[PDB]
Amino acid sequence: DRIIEKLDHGWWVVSHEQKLWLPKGELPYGEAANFDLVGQRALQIGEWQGEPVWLVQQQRRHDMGSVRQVIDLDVGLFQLAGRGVQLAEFYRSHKYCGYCGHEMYPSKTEWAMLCSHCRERYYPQIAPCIIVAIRRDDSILLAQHTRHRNGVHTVLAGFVEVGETLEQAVAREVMEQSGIKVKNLRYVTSQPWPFPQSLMTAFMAEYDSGDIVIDPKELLEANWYRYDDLPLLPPPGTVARRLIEDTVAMCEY
Amino acid sequence: DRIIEKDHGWWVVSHEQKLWLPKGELPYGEAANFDLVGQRALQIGEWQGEPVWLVQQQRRHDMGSVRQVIDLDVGLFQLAGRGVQLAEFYRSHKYCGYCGHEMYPSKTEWAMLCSHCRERYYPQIAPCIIVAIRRDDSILLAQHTRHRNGVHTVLAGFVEVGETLEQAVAREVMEQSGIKVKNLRYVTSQPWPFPQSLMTAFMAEYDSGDIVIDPKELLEANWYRYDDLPLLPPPGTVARRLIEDTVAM
Ligand SMILES: NC(=O)c1ccc[n+]([C@@H]2O[C@H](COP(=O)([O-])OP(=O)(O)OC[C@H]3O[C@@H](n4cnc5c(N)ncnc54)[C@H](O)[C@@H]3O)[C@@H](O)[C@H]2O)c1
Ligand SMILES: NC(=O)c1ccc[n+]([C@@H]2O[C@H](COP(=O)([O-])OP(=O)(O)OC[C@H]3O[C@@H](n4cnc5c(N)ncnc54)[C@H](O)[C@@H]3O)[C@@H](O)[C@H]2O)c1
Ligand SMILES: [Zn+2]
Ligand SMILES: [Zn+2]
């Protein structure tokens, strides 16, 4: 944490209310003076290839928008842009102490908010979330979502509840949304997803039993699609798409 | 979520990160046994065809940690952990952190809602890595500065915002021990309500580096041969599960 000088440089995440400043559609890069940031306060949130990544908690007049717009960057830098967006919301969300009502102040030694009155504190909230590609022989279960409305057929996802494992969360979400039981559950990777603050844990699984019965609150439609006859898919750069490619590349025939 | 009547099952009576443990054990039976009739409860799960209830209440005697009841079956201990964490979730959002007004709970999910500014919160689960680092016939085991109890265990740390589980493993191992690892394999996960972690358990393999410990986290660390292990964390912890899987090789 520090006040920005003229000869500070790097990547500047100027963020407020889940948006960040992307003039010309790009993450600002360069010297502080080129963005009128001298004298402002910033937290260094990481480093990319020799360059500090800076979080400035500030609203600009124009070009504020979604961090999704810089998802074409190297994954490592896009994760760091998302860190800034999530940190600015973390601070905004703990202006007051939840236990106490009293105003909070930020730690100097880590990402945390401390109460001026209570002994209590908070750290940023990461929301663990499962996402699973279910295979049935030569086919993959794909579904359209009620709250999306986008023509994309994708795999099944949901937030982990308190007191449950990732494995229980997969079995519970698959059952609730689609009525099927799965076997041979297998972890493959994870992915920070700042929309607003999820951590994806990505799984493959195999069909075991049951018939597709939908919860219409979550799914408009679900079905088994043969690996070479697929519909429209979620974009590259999501673990969902990678899970579907891996499952296709598996189908061995 | 409603008022309790003379109702049955497992009772998680929790205030300020403790629950009521008469005789050291979880209360089980009808509401009248425990002077609970007319109080407010939330059903938080089901165990062997019987409800598990959370009552947000302080008792005068025998309040304790959920750790006392870890000898229960994993599935029930998970539910008692849920009640403790749920009670602390509600207490931690009496007030809205955005605008400062009092919140009120959702009736359709576990959530706290703000009438005044229309933001909400869900229960915080803190993802946390734990990893058994294997080197041929050997496993990395460390003594912790926090507990100081003769127990040699594996390495663990909280995942950061913006990082993967894989980067969190590599980072925590590097910061605590100085070694670089490879061949990360996921094994399992486990809720750990102390106060609110979700452990994601990994195996890794020694790639390179020498052991140089952070004396603010570790007192000591070394490579132990799989059949000549020091005192290990108690069975039933996820740390013990990790070590026993790597011993089995
Ligand atoms: N990277 C990917 O491949 C990928 C793909 C799909 C979804 N996702 C992410 O996974 C998350 C969940 O997907 P979804 O469509 O099932 O939910 P959603 O995107 O429809 O989110 C809204 C609902 O989640 C519910 N919920 C329960 N617990 C929550 C918690 N801790 N935090 C926030 N919301 C909670 C709330 O009721 C809320 O109405 C989302 O963050 C989504 O962006 C990532
Ligand atoms: N299941 C098992 O067998 C097992 C074994 C070992 C450790 N664990 C868990 O993993 C943790 C690792 O030990 P420890 O060093 O964190 O002890 P700790 O709980 O005392 O750590 C607290 C410190 O870590 C940071 N911290 C706490 N919560 C955080 C959060 N959400 N986000 C970021 N940072 C946070 C803070 O700096 C704090 O000073 C343990 O606290 C415990 O919960 C589980
Ligand atoms: Zn306070
Ligand atoms: Zn509010």
UniProtKB/Swiss-Prot annotation, chain A:
Source organism: Escherichia coli (strain K12)
Protein name: NAD-capped RNA hydrolase NudC
Cofactor notes: Divalent metal cations. Mg(2+) or Mn(2+).
Pfam families named among the record's database cross-references: NUDIX, Zn_ribbon_NUD
Positions with a binding annotation for a divalent metal cation 2: 173
Positions occupied by motif Nudix box: 158-179
Residues bound to substrate: 24, 68, 110, 123, 191-198, 240
Residues that hold Zn(2+) according to the record: 97, 100, 115, 118
Keyword vocabulary terms for this entry: Hydrolase, Magnesium, Manganese, Metal-binding, NAD, Zinc
Binding site for a divalent metal cation 1: 157, 177, 218
Entry cofactors: Mg(2+); Mn(2+); Zn(2+)
Family matches, as InterPro entries: NAD-cap_RNA_hydrolase_NudC, NudC-like_C, NUDIX_hydrolase-like_dom_sf, NUDIX_hydrolase_CS, NUDIX_hydrolase_dom, RNA_Hydrolase_NudC, Znr_NADH_PPase
Quaternary structure note: Homodimer.
Residues annotated as domain Nudix hydrolase: 124-247
Gene3D superfamilies hit by this protein: 3.90.79.20, Nucleoside Triphosphate Pyrophosphohydrolase (3.90.79.10)
Taxonomic placement: Bacteria, Pseudomonadati, Pseudomonadota, Gammaproteobacteria, Enterobacterales
Single biological process term from Gene Ontology: mRNA stabilization
List of residues binding a divalent metal cation 3: 173, 177, 218
